[PDB]
Amino acid sequence: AVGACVLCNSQTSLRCGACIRRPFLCCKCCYDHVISTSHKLVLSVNPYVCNAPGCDVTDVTQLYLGGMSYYCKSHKPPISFPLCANGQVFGLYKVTDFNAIATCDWTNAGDYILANTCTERLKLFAAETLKATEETFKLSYGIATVREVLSDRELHLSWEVGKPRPPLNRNYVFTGYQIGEYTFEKDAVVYRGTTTYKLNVGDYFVLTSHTVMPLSAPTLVPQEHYVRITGLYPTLNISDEFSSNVANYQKVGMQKYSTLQGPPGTGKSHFAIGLALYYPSARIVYTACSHAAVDALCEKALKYLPIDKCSRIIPARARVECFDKFKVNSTLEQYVFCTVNALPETTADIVVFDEISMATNYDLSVVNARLRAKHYVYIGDPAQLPAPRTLLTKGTLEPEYFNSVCRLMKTIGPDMFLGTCRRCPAEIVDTVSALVYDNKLKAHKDKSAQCFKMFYKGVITHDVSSAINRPQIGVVREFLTRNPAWRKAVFISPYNSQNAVASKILGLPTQTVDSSQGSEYDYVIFTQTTETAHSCNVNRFNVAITRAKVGILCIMSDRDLYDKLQFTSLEI
Numbered sequence: 001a002v003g004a005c006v007l008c009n010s011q012t013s014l015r016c017g018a019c020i021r022r023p024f025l026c027c028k029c030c031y032d033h034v035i036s037t038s039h040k041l042v043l044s045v046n047p048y049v050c051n052a053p054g055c056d057v058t059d060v061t062q063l064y065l066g067g068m069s070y071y072c073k074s075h076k077p078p079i080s081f082p083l084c085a086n087g088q089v090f091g092l093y094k095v096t097d098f099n100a101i102a103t104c105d106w107t108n109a110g111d112y113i114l115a116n117t118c119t120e121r122l123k124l125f126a127a128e129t130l131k132a133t134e135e136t137f138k139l140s141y142g143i144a145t146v147r148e149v150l151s152d153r154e155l156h157l158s159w160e161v162g163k164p165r166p167p168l169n170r171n172y173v174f175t176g177y178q179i180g181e182y183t184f185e186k187d188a189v190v191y192r193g194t195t196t197y198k199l200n201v202g203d204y205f206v207l208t209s210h211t212v213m214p215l216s217a218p219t220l221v222p223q224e225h226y227v228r229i230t231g232l233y234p235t236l237n238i239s240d241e242f243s244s245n246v247a248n249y250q251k252v253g254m255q256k257y258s259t260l261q262g263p264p265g266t267g268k269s270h271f272a273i274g275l276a277l278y279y280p281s282a283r284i285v286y287t288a289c290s291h292a293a294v295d296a297l298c299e300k301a302l303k304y305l306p307i308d309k310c311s312r313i314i315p316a317r318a319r320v321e322c323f324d325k326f327k328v329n330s331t332l333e334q335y336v337f338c339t340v341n342a343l344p345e346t347t348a349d350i351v352v353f354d355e356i357s358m359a360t361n362y363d364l365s366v367v368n369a370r371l372r373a374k375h376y377v378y379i380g381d382p383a384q385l386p387a388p389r390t391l392l393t394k395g396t397l398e399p400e401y402f403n404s405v406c407r408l409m410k411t412i413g414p415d416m417f418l419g420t421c422r423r424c425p426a427e428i429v430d431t432v433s434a435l436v437y438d439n440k441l442k443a444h445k446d447k448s449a450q451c452f453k454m455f456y457k458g459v460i461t462h463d464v465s466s467a468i469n470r471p472q473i474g475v476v477r478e479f480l481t482r483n484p485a486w487r488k489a490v491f492i493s494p495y496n497s498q499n500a501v502a503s504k505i506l507g508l509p510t511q512t513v514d515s516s517q518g519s520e521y522d523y524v525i526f527t528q529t530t531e532t533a534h535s536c537n538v539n540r541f542n543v544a545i546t547r548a549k550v551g552i553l554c555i556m557s558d559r560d561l562y563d564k565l566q567f568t569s570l571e572i
């Protein structure tokens with residue numbers, strides 16, 4: 001009941017009872033909150049409610065202190081002081097942005113803008129409030145009870161009446177009942193259990209609504225610049241492979257934290273693993289939000305670092321299959337690879353946090369709270385995809401608002417920029433360089449002459465809201481017969497339902513733009529599917545076309561992005 005004010009740190013007995021996170025507010029800030037919002041319940045040792053029997057007055061502006069008790073206007077004794085007066089709320093030890101965070105529903109883009117432009121303590125309040133709001137929203141959907149089991153990978157579902165049905169994609173993970181976590185894909189539906197189980201008829205699945213823990217550590221520690229490399233000991237014998245990053249590795253040791261913007265295929269994992277070879281005695285914890293980002297870092301370390309000093313931390317509540325070649329859960333190995341949600345309480349000489357566009361401020365804070373390091377390196381690309389914000393429906397979230405790190409990279413610029421793309425044919429590099437990198441990305445490869453674009457609106461159908469464009473898939477099928485080398489292409493689209501249809505019609509392996517991030521393929525076939533804000537998002541468009549090493553076929557819906565593609569146009 002006694003704590004510190006989330007706005008000015010002043011000690012107080014007051015917490016806001018109307019705030020979902022119940023933050024400690026001092027007399028000054030508590031007043032400026034209750035007097036400007038619908039929030040009127042104030043909590044101390046005892047709540048600020050009228051003590052008079054059977055009285056329901058709980059509004060602090062309608063209450064007074066009579067002796068050492070609280071009463072409303074109808075029950076106060078002659079000698080009483082208002083609880084709200086002179087810009088203060090009574091209590092021991094005697095804000096426009098805080099009000100908006102405290103009262104918003106997190107459905108507008110402006111809510112996320114504020115959560116990232118506010119002061120550091122308000123970024124944690126915002127991140128805690130958003131996460132709790134997202135989980136209290138997880139109690140709103142309807143239960144799915146299995147009507148029948150068709151096979152080992154297919155079933156029919158019976159949904160709860162009155163409550164909405166949640167989007168059936170890999171994004172939403174249900175906990176089966178505890179028969180393990182399970183996912184779904186589209187009356188026949190495809191079931192994917194984390195644990196193999198004889199799907200009982202009648203057994204139900206419900207979305208995991210986990211408890212949101214409070215945040216203590218800032219999203220970014222206060223920056224410190226040094227005159228010499230601190231706590232790290234460089235090699236003089238550094239492999240020529242990593243020579244291009246020596247000045248940047250030295251910058252890493254001369255700052256508390258550093259940001260690295262690495263466009264697709266510019267050498268982010270190479271830089272991260274080369275940091276270990278540059279400071280050979282340094283203990284490095286490699287972290288990212290997803291198991292896939294952590295696994296890609298593991299694959300790079302397997303090729304350059306001693307396997308006996310590596311360890312992959314895997315949580316006991318295993319959801320997906322991940323990296324198997326390092327010793328598991330050895331927290332004290334020199335190189336620790338672990339997702340943010342599974343990080344142990346440890347220290348390190350360097351912490352490398354990869355795929356930074358996918359981090360939230362909640363993740364940034366958790367990393368600072370579990371890992372106490374000499375240096376923190378943030379690697380990613382603000383021109384790539386952010387974490388899905390399930391509550392956000394109105395407006396688009398710009399890159400400078402993804403998290404604190406992305407805000408810095410878009411405002412003051414990143415500390416380090418990898419400006420040469422080694423993956424993509426020049427047609428793709430020239431396109432994304434002009435689109436999202438202010439013409440600063442350069443192509444290492446020549447033009448492949450295997451990058452094609454076709455403007456074909458087709459016909460848009462919908463599986464609920466997830467879109468399908470069968471004529472765009474038909475155009476691809478026609479192209480494949482005439483271009484058999486493309487038989488080995490990966491089919492990519494902004495929609496899971498478009499991918500499901502293309503998987504059955506084309507037989508190509510399938511990937512959404514969002515699940516393709518961090519991966520690369522020789523050939524990519526991309527169907528835009530629709531002209532929505534989702535399919536036209538320039539970051540999503542950037543990720544989609546930079547998956548290709550050799551060739552890409554883009555079947556476009558949007559004239560704008562089609563005209564921007566520096567590809568050979570095709571006809572049909």
Ligand SMILES: [Zn+2]
Pocket residue numbers: 005006007008009010025026027028029030
């Ligand atoms: Zn205060």
Ligand SMILES: [Zn+2]
Pocket residue numbers: 016017018019033039102
């Ligand atoms: Zn409040």
Ligand SMILES: [Zn+2]
Pocket residue numbers: 050051052055056057071072073074075
């Ligand atoms: Zn009363």
